[PDB]
């Protein structure tokens, strides 16, 4: 189509250069933009840009190249706030509206500075028999897998930050309604590091 | 807000009704274009407005109509409203000398089947494990909303009255609880990790929100349980020296 992007997801480390490129057809597009969009929200104009070369705006730089009809992002020092979808946008004449490529999903990744990857079973505040499982302080290298079973759910990794003590960590969750069900079993599924810790 | 402005925020229908949709440009904008996003995809363009005139249209068929009035606001307005016209739908606005093109905050449009496919989400709190705060000596609550239909809430964790955001990570998409499905209900988790002496004190109270948008008043309800309106959820776990 008029617009061409990657989803990914990309992954970049964090602190790493994150890149992300843009192609388009139209040889008569006179203006380029890339915009941000968080889960659950709108997207944000980042950057635009209209002619050949770079523009630079504090960590980010856009590069345009209109005989090659590409455009770029470059995101120096990634952090983890800039894990988002980025959208590049191009006004074909002047006034028109913006298309948009599909948007590329990028997840900056922190190194985990003392791996400590374990399963814990969590009880309910509210009664004993009701429990979900933390597979947590894993690695960044650590896919987790989505469940096999229909009745067992998973979510994907999340990263967060204790920030008064620059401290991050990785955690998946999952839960199911079986009794069968044991966290020992939970994340069978995904190639789990050797040295996971499983309590109860 | 001088902001771009729409509204309403959601908008829950069945087949072959119809919505409007209101938007109210960036004040100093006189432009509006108004775009489709899926999950998954860039935002579709589906018409822009400048001088009440509808200057551009992208590939979106007839049943998809709108309107600028004099003072620079629009409405779109489509019917017929079909299962996959459920999207995000977004107002963007722009003048006719800058580059700039703004997103408002988007109506987010679900069309189902039957209105009993809406319900509100039951949400708990799980306290820390022993064995957590004994290995690392920082404790992870979790926070799970499940059963939820349409798939949009907003999870928001309190300490002792106040929201926090530090140690905080809530998934970015729902989970669908019955993949196969169409109208399944979805669930969310959200982690929320203080350091074990901070879990260890009971005066300390701990209050996962959850914002559901449902129906409101518009709505017909006859069925037994209760009328899924747009509510808030919580749950609650206090700390203990354990």
């Known amino acids: 189509k008029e617009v061409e992007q990657n989803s990914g997801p990309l992954s970049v480390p964090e602190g790493a250069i994150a890149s992300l490129n843009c192609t388009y057809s139209?040889?008569?597009?006179?203006?380029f933009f890339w915009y941000r969009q968080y889960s659950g929200k709108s997207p944000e104009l980042i950057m635009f840009?209209?002619?050949?070369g770079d523009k630079e705006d504090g960590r980010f730089t856009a590069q345009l190249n209109k005989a090659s009809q590409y455009i770029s992002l470059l995101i120096r020092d990634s952090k983890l706030s800039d894990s988002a979808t980025y959208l590049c946008?191009?006004?074909?004449?002047?006034?028109?509206?913006?298309?948009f490529g599909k948007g590329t999903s990028l997840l900056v990744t922190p190194h985990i500075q003392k791996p400590d990857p374990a399963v814990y079973q969590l009880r309910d505040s509210k009664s004993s028999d009701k429990s979900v499982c933390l597979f947590t302080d894993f690695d960044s290298q650590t896919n987790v897998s989505q469940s096999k079973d229909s009745d067992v759910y998973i979510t994907d990794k999340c990263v967060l930050d204790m920030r008064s003590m620059d401290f991050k960590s990785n955690s998946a969750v999952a839960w199911s309604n079986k009794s069968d069900f044991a966290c020992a079993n939970a994340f069978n599924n995904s190639i789990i590091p050797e040295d996971t810790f499983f309590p109860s | 807000d001088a902001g771009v402005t729409q509204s309403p925020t959601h908008l829950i229908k069945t087949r072959g009704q119809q919505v409007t949709l209101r938007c109210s440009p960036k004040?100093?904008?006189?432009?509006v274009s108004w775009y489709q996003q899926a999950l998954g995809q860039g935002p579709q363009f589906i018409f822009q407005?400048?001088?009440?005139?509808?200057?551009q249209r992208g590939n979106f068929p007839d049943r998809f109509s709108g309107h600028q009035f004099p003072n620079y606001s629009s409405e779109l307005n489509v019917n017929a409203l079909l299962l996959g016209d459920s999207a995000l739908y977004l107002c963007?606005?722009?003048?006719?000398?800058?580059?700039?093109?703004?997103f408002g905050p988007g109506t987010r449009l679900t069309v189902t089947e039957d209105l009993k496919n809406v319900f509100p989400p039951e949400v708990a709190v799980f306290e820390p494990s022993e064995a957590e705060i004994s290995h690392t000596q920082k404790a992870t609550l979790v926070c799970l909303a499940t059963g939820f239909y349409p798939d949009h809430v907003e999870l928001s964790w309190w300490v002792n009255g106040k929201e926090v955001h530090s140690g905080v990570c809530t998934d970015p998409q729902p989970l669908k609880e019955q993949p196969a499905l169409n109208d399944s209900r979805y669930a969310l988790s959200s982690r929320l990790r203080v350091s074990a002496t901070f879990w260890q004190d009971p005066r300390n109270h701990f209050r996962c929100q959850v914002q559901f948008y449902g129906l409101s008043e518009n709505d017909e309800w006859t069925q037994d349980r209760a009328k899924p309106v747009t509510q808030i959820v919580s749950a609650e776990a206090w700390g203990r020296a354990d």
């Open positions: 963007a606005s722009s003048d006719t000398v800058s580059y700039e093109q703004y």
């Open positions: 139209d040889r008569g597009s006179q203006s």
């Open positions: 840009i209209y002619s050949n």
């Open positions: 946008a191009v006004r074909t004449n002047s006034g028109y509206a913006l298309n």
């Open positions: 004040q100093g904008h006189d432009t």
């Open positions: 407005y400048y001088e009440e005139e509808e200057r």
